[PDB]
């Protein structure tokens, strides 16, 4: 059954040993369960860093394989209004364990989607029944959580996945599958991941699909770029060089050719050029101001559609004017 | 738990509780009460302190009674709140910061604070922060910006440069394009206050403040729509 699943779900960690890139948080929670002194928890972090996986693995470790009987899980797909908090959560938190298996666990995944009234109602539920129950909140946006709820929870930050953890997970996936990955392909995959393991797994699955003979074919960086349709570093470098050195006609022709060669999107080129320019050594600081403002404006305009050729010419002109200072 | 934007859910008053027919009925008389002024409140607090002279003298706070009474009379027009505050201060052997119930300011009072400023506070940032903290309901409502737009000309009876008016109106127009974020209201109010403070002078005569006339326009538009449907 696991074979038919998408790789993002097929490779979900089952034990806390399989969660990488969060060594400090993982060690703290593991030792907390070892000492049986789990406090109310908050897991704050960006998408695909292992919060849900970590909390489910911790529940499995605490309650073995029967965690579903003494764990109450609620997420944004369920209604969690003030009535739900008053009735369902309160009754679960105020009832004894199934077999006196220590304390009960309530997981509020994506709690940043809950209303202010429900969060306010949750305060005294959390406080009163701490002996019999422990709460776990998961979030990507802290500004949606009320100050009282944040104060009641011990905070743990899930950082963007470090490179080494991604490499180890990729090696595990490659040994699981009959797949080969090139070092340059792995470097490109990590670069495009942006610290999200879901993106890595999805792109790897697409790359395996792209291979004509996955039993023997090796995934190269070209395969990754084809699957993602993203620009190559060489294309970005050539476009930037033409913009910063050649005339308007030559730069326009170069941009058009680079885009038409592989059907690249202008937003991807803008992002790549911004990343490249972030490392440029600028002797004039107004240049950075103009670059940032104009490129942000162009990105915002592109987000709403518009004319593609005019936007590309705008990017060229903005870069040239900024560097003319 | 409300998340409703009806009249009554914003303000509890005769207008929101009654209707026009009842209020304008010839057999109904309406009398409006004002907060108790300082003279009466001071007199009554002095009487209360005199009635409790023995305990105040025993606790040594008697000598300081005036020092607090004039404060209380200066803080609120609520007789019950003033008496409660006096009792709390007197019964306490220690020293605490005397405070009364907070009193909300009216719509025109808020408009005047935004335009001319506040006597008590010389720092505009503190005044704006306090106004937003304690008067969020009034400031967030879209009619406050209309009132500012329609009353900013009252300054000096409209005898200031057209540049300042243009700046104020341009800022309000920019705020109208901010999807009602708190930053928009803060920016608009701060711009208006700063512009009016930059030209404040002792020798100025101000005009009368009036409510915006948008509702009249809406009523006329509804009548026009009815007439247009009839013609169609």
């Amino acid at each position: 059954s696991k074979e038919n699943l998408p790789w993002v779900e097929k490779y979900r960690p089952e034990t806390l040993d399989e969660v990488y890139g969060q060594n400090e948080v993982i060690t703290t929670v593991r030792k907390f369960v070892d000492e049986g002194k789990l406090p109310h928890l908050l897991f704050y972090g960006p998408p695909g860093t292992g919060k849900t996986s970590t909390i489910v693995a911790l529940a499995r470790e605490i309650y073995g394989k029967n965690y579903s009987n003494m764990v109450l899980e609620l997420n944004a797909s369920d209604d969690r209004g003030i009535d739900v908090v008053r009735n369902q959560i309160k009754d679960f938190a105020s009832t004894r364990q199934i077999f006196s298996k220590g304390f009960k666990l309530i997981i509020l995944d994506e709690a940043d989607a809950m209303t202010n009234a429900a969060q306010n109602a949750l305060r005294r539920v959390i406080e009163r029944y701490t002996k019999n129950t422990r709460f776990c909140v998961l979030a990507n946006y802290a500004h949606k959580l009320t100050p009282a709820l944040l104060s009641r929870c011990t905070r743990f930050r899930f950082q963007p996945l470090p490179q080494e953890a991604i490499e180890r997970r990729i090696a595990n996936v490659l040994v699981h599958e009959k797949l080969k990955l090139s070092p340059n392909a792995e470097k490109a995959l990590i670069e495009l991941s942006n610290g999200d393991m879901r993106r890595v797994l999805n792109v790897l699955q697409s790359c395996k699909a792209t291979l004509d003979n996955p039993d023997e074919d090796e995934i190269s960086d070209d395969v990754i770029y084809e699957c993602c349709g993203a620009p190559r570093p060489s294309d970005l470098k050539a476009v930037l060089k033409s913009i910063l050195e050649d005339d308007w006609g030559t730069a326009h022709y170069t941009l058009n050719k680079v885009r038409s060669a592989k059907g690249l999107a202008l937003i991807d080129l803008i992002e790549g050029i911004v990343k490249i320019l972030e490392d440029y050594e600028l002797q004039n600081e107004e240049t950075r101001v103009h670059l940032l403002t104009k490129l942000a404006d162009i990105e915002y305009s592109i987000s709403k559609g518009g004319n593609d050729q005019i936007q590309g010419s705008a990017v060229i002109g903005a870069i040239k004017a900024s560097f003319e200072n | 738990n409300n998340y409703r934007k009806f009249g009554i859910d914003y303000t509890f008053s005769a207008e929101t509780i009654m209707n026009k027919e009842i209020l304008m009925h010839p057999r109904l008389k309406r009398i409006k009460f004002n907060p108790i002024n300082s003279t009466l409140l001071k007199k009554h607090l002095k009487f209360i302190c005199v009635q409790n002279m023995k305990m105040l003298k025993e606790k040594n706070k008697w000598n300081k009674r005036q020092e607090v009474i004039d404060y209380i009379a200066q803080e609120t027009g609520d007789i019950r709140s003033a008496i409660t505050t006096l009792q709390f201060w007197a019964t306490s052997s220690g020293s605490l910061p005397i405070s009364t119930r907070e009193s909300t300011i009216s719509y025109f009072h808020a408009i005047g604070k935004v335009i001319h400023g506040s006597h008590s506070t010389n720092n505009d940032n503190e005044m704006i922060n306090n106004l937003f903290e304690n008067s969020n309901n009034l400031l967030s409502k879209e009619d406050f910006k209309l009132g500012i737009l329609e009353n900013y000309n009252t300054f000096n009876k409209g005898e200031f440069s057209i540049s300042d008016a243009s700046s104020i109106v341009d800022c309000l127009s920019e705020c109208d394009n901010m999807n009602g974020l708190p930053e928009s209201n803060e920016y608009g109010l701060r711009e208006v206050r700063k512009t009016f403070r930059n030209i404040s002078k002792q020798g100025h005569n101000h005009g009368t403040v009036y409510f915006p006339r948008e509702w009249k326009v809406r009523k006329l538009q509804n009548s026009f729509k009815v007439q247009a449907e009839d013609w169609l």
């Binding site: - | 057209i162 540049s163 008016a165 243009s166 109106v169 341009d170 309000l172 948008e214």
Partner: protein, 354 residues
């Protein structure tokens, strides 16, 4: 009797008399109407777009398209707010103006139009055996006034149910039409009639009505004053003829819409005096104009172009005026209350002039 705008309304493609190329294109569309794509006619207001749409429908079906009745369709929002829409129907086509429902226009697209698209039209064959099916024609007036949500809701309705429905949308500008909708329609440009054609139509009406005309220059002046709007041209012709005992003369005044003269007076006042009090008076004039349900964008455009016609102003003043007009037109498009933006535009103009 009926107004001369409707009295002499052409009722067929062959009855058209201006923009012959557009007439030929419409006739070519009606040759094999079985595979007629969705149509989007765009052009200046009052140029005869609805007339041409009705002529095409008449050619496809027949004169019966002009037999129109009106029904009231009731809709209920999530908050239980009950409201109504007018549906103009003929035996072969339907007419709707969802923009009349404001922000609720999307509901009309989601409930009414979809249902119309879902109900296949079938009828017993008079002579042959078996049923016969015909697609329904639907006209959407003021398409450019639809909210983006309604336009999005139109997409899959147009695509999936193409067999049962063919949409004919009409608009004055395509700028507010989302790209997906423009992609799904055959775009037809409807140019305004030239002054000569307007004068010819007016002279034909004059001959029909036995109105004594001193010279044909009066018709040319009326056409110039109408700025290419034939409906306005006919309305002013009728008003002038009635006010002059059906005997027009070169001295007869040319009647213009009252709000236009009001805007001209506002422009003159703005140019003359520039101060805060003048701005308040201008605000009063603007509020009076808005009380008559004149669109804010139309007010801004008319005021801008009236200001640009003033001779005393110089090139720099006009350039600043057009800059401010563009900026505040964008602000109106993205805004909620129009008074802020109109007052800001007038204040900026006063600052630049002074």
């Amino acid at each position: 009797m009926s107004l001369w705008v409707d009295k002499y309304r052409p009722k067929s493609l062959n009855a058209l008399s201006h923009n012959e190329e557009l007439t030929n294109f419409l006739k070519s569309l009606s040759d094999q109407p079985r595979d007629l794509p969705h149509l989007l006619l765009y052009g200046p207001n009052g140029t005869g777009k609805k007339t041409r749409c009705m002529a095409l429908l008449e050619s496809i079906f027949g004169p019966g398209v002009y037999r129109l009745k009106i029904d009231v369709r009731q809709f209920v929002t999530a908050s239980n707010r009950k409201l109504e829409l007018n549906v103009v129907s003929s035996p072969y086509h339907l007419e709707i103006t969802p923009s009349d429902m404001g922000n609720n226009d999307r509901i009309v697209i989601q409930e009414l139009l979809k249902e119309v698209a879902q109900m296949e039209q079938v009828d017993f064959q008079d002579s042959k055996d078996g049923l016969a099916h015909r697609y329904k024609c639907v006209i959407i007036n003021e398409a450019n006034s639809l909210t983006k949500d309604a336009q999005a809701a139109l997409r899959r309705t147009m695509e999936k149910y193409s067999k049962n429905i063919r949409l004919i949308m009409v608009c004055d500008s395509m700028s507010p039409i989302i790209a997906p909708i423009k992609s799904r329609c055959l775009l037809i440009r409807c140019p305004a009639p030239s002054d000569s054609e307007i004068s010819t139509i007016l002279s034909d009406v004059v001959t029909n009505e036995r109105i004594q005309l001193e010279t044909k220059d009066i018709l040319k002046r009326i056409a110039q004053a109408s700025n290419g709007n034939l409906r306005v041209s006919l309305l002013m012709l009728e008003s002038m003829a009635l006010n002059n005992e059906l005997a027009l003369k070169s001295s007869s005044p040319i009647i213009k819409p009252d709000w236009i003269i009001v805007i001209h007076k506002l422009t003159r006042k703005i140019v003359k005096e520039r101060s805060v009090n003048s701005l308040i008076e201008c605000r009063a004039v603007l509020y009076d104009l808005l009380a008559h349900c004149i669109p804010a964008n139309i007010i801004l455009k008319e005021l801008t172009f009236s200001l640009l016609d003033v001779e005393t102003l110089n090139t720099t003043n006009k350039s600043s005026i057009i800059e401010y007009s563009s900026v505040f037109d964008e602000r109106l498009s993205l805004g909620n209350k129009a008074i802020f933006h109109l007052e800001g535009f007038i204040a900026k103009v006063m600052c630049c002039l002074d």
